[PDB]
């Protein structure tokens, strides 16, 4: 049997998982409590007499976003000892998420996921949803990853993190947390997608109009990407690409797994229905530099590996022609030592649309994950804003005053420097 465990942490982890799990509820055909009014057995576990309890271990250190799940319409959906809420917040600080308000909540997070891994027959992946610029999304993201790697080492892990953004911030201590979360993204994880927050503001600007989108609309476009990514495990299809096939085809060299994402049928009903949605134009929009959700223009980068997960009635004849015109486009340049790398997969089940939402009913889809070397600049704009405040030791008295030692800043700084030269040498 195929299955996967969702290990959301932080308020970004809870809220993204809220949109991601309502989508999985409506896709598989389960009503909000537990019932259908055989594809469920990868995100839910059968109770034997009805109820489909999910495989999510939603984590936060405060009861303000966990308790609204606990009292919301999905109250009798999640196992209540999977929704683990702490008592006091890390407060945008890596040192409290790793040391201070620490081990008393990560030891209780571990035996819940031990029971999940025992009650599943052949485990495949570990989907982590967190924000690395904050508190519990970075600190408990790192503790729960160091512990997960040392006992569950044979299985893969997918860190879909909300990487800090260049212009829009909603934090000022944001450059410290993510530089110090690079340990939980460099040598202790497999494939990882840097999804941003105003890069997704723009894709709903250009295409869905939406004059003022909230976090609810943002978490649903992330939910679309995650759905089509693990869709091949769930439904049938033509030639499939699974979680273990992601790392064998996208990851060239052991440290390079920092990845982009570009879904591209993000069209409202008015724009889409005056338009054909054939696979040629949906893959030009998939490779289109603004439809990717990170802000780093790949025209000044260089693609190394691209996995494209198509969905809907996509026959394999026209996807070979659709990638053929991607060769002829000079603006999409590729690295010389990976000439042949396009790994495509086709699902049959057309994308389910959330009611009352913003995606239209579209019969075809494509979600593209790319290994462009432009991702190095995503780490370099954060390297600049880390150096500006650290130069006179600002904010670090409340980074060392609770258990962390100074000098972990400097070696984490050297990890970004070695990462930038790593992406420089892998190209040329």
């Amino acid at each position: 049997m195929r299955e996967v465990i969702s290990i959301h942490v932080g308020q970004a982890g809870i809220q993204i998982g809220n949109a991601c799990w309502e989508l999985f509820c409506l896709e598989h055909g389960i009503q909000p409590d537990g019932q259908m009014p055989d594809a469920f057995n990868t995100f839910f576990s059968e109770t034997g007499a009805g109820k489909h309890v999910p495989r999510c271990v939603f984590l936060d250190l405060e009861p303000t976003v966990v308790d609204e799940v606990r009292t919301g319409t999905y109250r009798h959906l999640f196992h209540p000892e999977q929704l683990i809420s702490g008592k006091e917040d890390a407060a945008n600080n890596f040192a409290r998420g790793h040391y201070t308000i620490g081990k008393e909540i990560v030891d209780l997070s571990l035996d819940r996921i031990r029971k999940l891994a025992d009650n599943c027959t052949g485990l495949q992946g570990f989907l982590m949803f967190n924000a690395v610029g904050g508190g519990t999304g970075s600190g408990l993201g790192c503790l729960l990853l160091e512990r997960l790697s040392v006992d569950y080492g044979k299985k893969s892990k997918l860190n879909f993190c909300s990487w800090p953004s260049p212009q829009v911030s909603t934090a000022v201590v944001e450059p410290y947390n993510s530089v110090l979360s690079t340990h939980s993204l460099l040598e202790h994880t497999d494939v990882a997608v840097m999804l941003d927050n105003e890069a997704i503001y723009d894709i709903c600007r250009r295409n869905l109009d939406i004059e003022r989108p909230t976090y609810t609309n943002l978490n649903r476009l992330i939910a679309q990407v995650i759905s089509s990514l693990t869709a091949s495990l769930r439904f049938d299809g033509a030639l499939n690409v699974d979680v273990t096939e992601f790392q064998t085809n996208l990851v060239p060299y052991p440290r390079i797994h920092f990845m982009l994402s570009s879904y591209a049928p993000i069209i409202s009903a008015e724009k889409a229905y005056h338009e054909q949605l054939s696979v040629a134009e949906i893959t030009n929009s998939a490779f289109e530099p603004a439809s990717m959700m990170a802000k780093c223009d790949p025209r000044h980068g260089k693609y190394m590996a691209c996995c494209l997960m198509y969905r809907g009635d996509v026959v394999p004849k026209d996807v070979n022609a659709a990638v053929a015109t991607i060769k002829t486009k000079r603006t999409i340049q590729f690295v010389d030592w990976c000439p042949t790398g396009f790994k495509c997969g086709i699902n049959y089940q057309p994308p389910t649309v959330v009611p009352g939402g913003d995606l239209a009913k579209v019969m075809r889809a494509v979600c593209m994950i790319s290994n462009s070397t432009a991702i190095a600049e995503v780490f370099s704009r954060m390297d600049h804003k880390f150096d500006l405040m650290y130069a006179k030791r600002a904010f670090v008295h409340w980074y060392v005053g609770e258990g962390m030692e100074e000098g972990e800043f400097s070696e984490a700084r050297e990890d970004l420097a070695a990462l930038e030269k790593d992406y420089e040498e892998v190209g040329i």
């Binding site: 049938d236 033509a238 009635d313 026959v315 049959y348 089940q349």
Partner: peptide, 24 residues
Amino acid sequence: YALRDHLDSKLVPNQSTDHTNVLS
């Protein structure tokens, strides 16, 4: 749902079933 492996060719292949004016 076997909608990739549509039989568009019979046992022998014989590909499956599916302006000008008048100057008389």
